[PDB]
Amino acid sequence: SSFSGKYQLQSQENFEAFMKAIGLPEELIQKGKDIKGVSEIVQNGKHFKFTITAGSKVIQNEFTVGEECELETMTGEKVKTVVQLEGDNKLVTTFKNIKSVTELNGDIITNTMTLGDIVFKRISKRIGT
Numbered sequence: 001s002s003f004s005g006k007y008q009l010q011s012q013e014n015f016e017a018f019m020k021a022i023g024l025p026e027e028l029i030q031k032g033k034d035i036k037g038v039s040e041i042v043q044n045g046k047h048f049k050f051t052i053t054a055g056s057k058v059i060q061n062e063f064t065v066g067e068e069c070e071l072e073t074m075t076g077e078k079v080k081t082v083v084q085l086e087g088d089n090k091l092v093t094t095f096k097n098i099k100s101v102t103e104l105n106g107d108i109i110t111n112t113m114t115l116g117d118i119v120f121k122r123i124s125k126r127i128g129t
């Protein structure tokens with residue numbers, strides 16, 4: 001149950017640069033750079049549900065830690081990958097050559113995606129039940 005909670009974005013580094021490189025239609029790139037998105041995570045042991053909302057674009061995802069699962073990326077592209085726990089508080093996966101780390105520390109979820117040399121980094125905070 002550790003990741004569960006509702007979280008809102010506070011600040012991000014390199015949003016625009018990273019969203020370009022991944023075939024994000026520019027309309028969303030500009031409308032998106034400023035949205036403090038909300039993440040809903042529901043964890044039950046290995047099983048994860050998470051929903052990322054950024055006004056009207058709702059991406060909902062589910063995975064089992066350790067299993068190969070379909071994930072829906074930024075662009076809407078669905079990609080087969082495995083998500084891994086590396087300790088109770090850290091989700092690590094790799095898709096379309098992006099290395100993604102999600103990390104809980106207290107009420108703070110830090111997510112970091114790197115495409116070759118670009119480090120897109122989102123920091124979020126818990127907002128209630």
Ligand SMILES: CCCCCCCCCCCCCCCC(=O)O
Pocket residue numbers: 028029031032035037052054055056057074111122
């Ligand atoms: C203006 C209305 C539509 C809103 C469009 C928002 C598009 C957002 C684009 C990228 C946001 C997704 C963030 C990645 C998810 C994550 O960090 O795990």
Ligand SMILES: CCCCCCCCCCCCCCCC(=O)O
Pocket residue numbers: 037038039041050052059061071072073074083091093100102109110111122123124
């Ligand atoms: C749309 C991006 C795809 C998501 C691929 C990462 C899968 C595991 C990590 C997601 C768990 C919830 C963390 C989101 C927190 C945040 O928005 O920064």
